[PDB]
Design a binder for these strands. Structure first.
Length: 537
RNA sequence: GCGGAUUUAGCUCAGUUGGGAGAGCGCCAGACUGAAGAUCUGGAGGUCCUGUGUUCGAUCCACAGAAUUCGCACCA
């Protein structure tokens, strides 16, 4: 049976999600005055195109944003961000938004216990209290659309707005081949295989499942299946016969430390469900791009072609070869460049997606382009310390932490991890490597301060232009840099430097404590008296 | 700057107390070289520092007036 776009009521426990399901069971069936229920053991489930009162899944824990994945991104195509009508913001309510919108999963914020604030309101009538946890509008983002928790009402108005959000995403169902499904909640135990409650979104399960864990990936043998029925049964027999659009307790003892992020499927067909299996491990991720600065030299070949009698005989040949293809007589050997690209590691799915959204944007080399070359949801690894050492980068961790082996590897590489930064976001660091003083190249900045000694507009054994002698004591008063010389703060003149004319000494660069005469620009428009010459790139 | 101070072929030098500018490298072939070409030779290049105290010879040193290397003034 084709699944309606499901919600789950994500958010903090008893922020109206837990209290929703417990009363939902009893209330909904009366409160609709209509049917269209597709109830399953998982929660209380009723289809989206019922003209009154609709709700879907419960995750009896808290979070369910990454738990409820499917083959487009989430299975909860519309997600409910559960805030309480009584009490605003709680932690998992805001994680649900980030993970969903950044992963392009439409969002309902259904501040639950809807009856209790804004007087049993509809979709667009709870807004004040609903916006307490952020709401936006339709699309992959969050519209405030409401479902209650202590009555079956307001849920009619869930249907209305929620479907228009749901439009963008939906991964349907079948009662055929192997199953697809995700975990609604899956309990975490090491050294035990605890049961996994799942929304089986598509396909048929008998009693076999496959899950990911905080241990390892494994393919469990279920002891039994137990499920509420939509109903259509592939097998009417004593428990088997799961279809898509079903919630299923998958009871299996080969289950590991399966998180609420994994999926619970089954594969016994791979001519359809392999292509659903792949896809339903994702809804955590996005993209980054950046580019790096390099070296090249067209001299290491053309210089070599020249005279010397062997090389001349070669030269007659080289010219002929060049005519055929320019790349043919080349004998260049230019090499090596480094900037500082970094490696990104993160652990919260909405967080990495957020970092990625900012990061992909930066790929423009103003004068440098610097961000991450690699990102992943994981832990710091051997690769990350290697990356830091090679480019002259550093390891950017969100809150991931570094294991024992990577730390040893880090020491050998002569680098050390930065993680748990505060703010934990890596985009600030990545944008510091980017631009900082890199696009400054005509901008003023003291980086070549010196004091003006004199000028030799007048004779000094040679009468010249307004050649200003200056004692360099910071950076370089050189003809490369520009200047703004300040009498004490009042600019005398500002321009570039294009002279080194003197009569005592002439030097390419006036550095350190050396005095050399250079007119600042060519001549000077006010000369003699002054103090600091800020040379600026 | 000033100078000490060369003064003086393009520059450099000599011609010089005061009787031609000695010749040359940057022009130049021979020469040379393995050939090439400068050599050597001698010529192209002779502003005579500038112009002059000075001049039968001032072409010189020297000065009319000014420039400069840097000790020195400057150098702080």
């Amino acid at each position: 049976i084709p699944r309606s776009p499901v919600v789950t009521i994500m958010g903090h426990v008893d922020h109206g999600k837990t209290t929703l399901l417990d009363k939902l069971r009893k209330t909904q069936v009366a409160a609709m005055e209509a049917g269209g229920i597709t109830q399953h053991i998982g929660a209380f489930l009723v289809s989206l195109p019922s003209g009154e009162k609709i709700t879907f899944l419960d995750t009896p824990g808290h979070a369910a944003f990454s738990a409820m994945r499917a083959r487009g991104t989430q299975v909860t195509d519309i997600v409910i961000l559960v805030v309480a009508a009584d009490d605003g913001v709680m932690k998992q309510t805001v994680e649900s938004i980030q993970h969903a919108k950044d992963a392009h999963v439409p969002i309902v914020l259904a501040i639950n216990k809807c009856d209790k604030a804004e007087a049993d309101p509809e979709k667009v009538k709870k807004e004040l209290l609903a916006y307490d946890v952020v709401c936006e509008d339709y699309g992959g983002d969050v519209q405030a659309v409401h479902v209650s928790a202590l009555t079956g009402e307001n849920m009619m108005a869930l249907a209305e707005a929620t479907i228009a959000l749901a439009e963008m995403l939906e991964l349907k169902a079948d009662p055929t081949g192997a199953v697809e499904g995700t975990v609604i909640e899956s309990f975490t135990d090491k050294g035990r295989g605890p049961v996994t409650t799942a929304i089986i979104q598509r396909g048929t399960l008998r009693k076999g499942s496959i899950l990911v864990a905080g241990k390892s990936w494994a393919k469990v043998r279920l002891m039994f299946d137990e499920n509420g029925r939509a109903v259509n049964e592939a097998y009417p027999s004593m428990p088997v016969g799961i279809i898509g659009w079903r919630d299923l307790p998958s009871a299996g003892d080969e289950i590991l430390e399966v998180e609420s992020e994994p999926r619970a499927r089954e594969v016994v067909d791979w001519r359809k469900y392999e292509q659903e299996q792949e896809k339903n491990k994702e809804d955590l991720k996005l993209i980054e791009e950046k580019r790096k600065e390099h070296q090249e030299a067209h001299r290491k070949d053309r210089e070599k072609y020249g005279t010397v009698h062997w090389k001349e005989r070669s030269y007659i040949k080289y010219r002929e070869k060049r005519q055929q293809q320019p790349l043919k007589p080349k004998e260049k050997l230019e090499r090596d460049s480094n900037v500082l690209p970094v490696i990104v590691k993160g652990d919260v799915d909405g967080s990495v997606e957020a970092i990625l959204n900012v990061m992909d944007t930066y790929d423009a080399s103003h004068e440098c382009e610097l961000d991450l070359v690699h990102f992943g949801v994981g832990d710091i690894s051997e690769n990350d310390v290697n990356l830091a050492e090679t480019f002259h980068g550093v390891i950017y961790g969100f809150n991931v932490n570094a294991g024992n082996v990577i730390q040893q590897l880090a020491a050998k590489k002569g680098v050390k991890i930065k993680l748990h930064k505060i703010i934990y976001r890596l985009i600030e660091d990545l944008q510091e490597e980017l631009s900082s003083r890199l696009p400054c190249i005509v901008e003023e900045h003291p980086i070549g301060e010196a004091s003006i000694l004199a000028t030799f507009s007048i004779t000094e054994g040679k009468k010249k232009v307004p050649v200003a002698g200056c004692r360099v004591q910071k950076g370089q008063i050189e003809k490369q840099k520009k200047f703004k010389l300040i009498r004490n703060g009042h600019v005398i003149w500002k321009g570039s430097l294009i002279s080194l004319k003197h009569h005592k000494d002439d030097t390419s660069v006036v550095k350190t404590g050396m005095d050399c005469g250079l007119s600042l620009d060519e001549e000077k428009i006010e000369f003699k008296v002054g103090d600091a010459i800020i040379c600026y790139e």
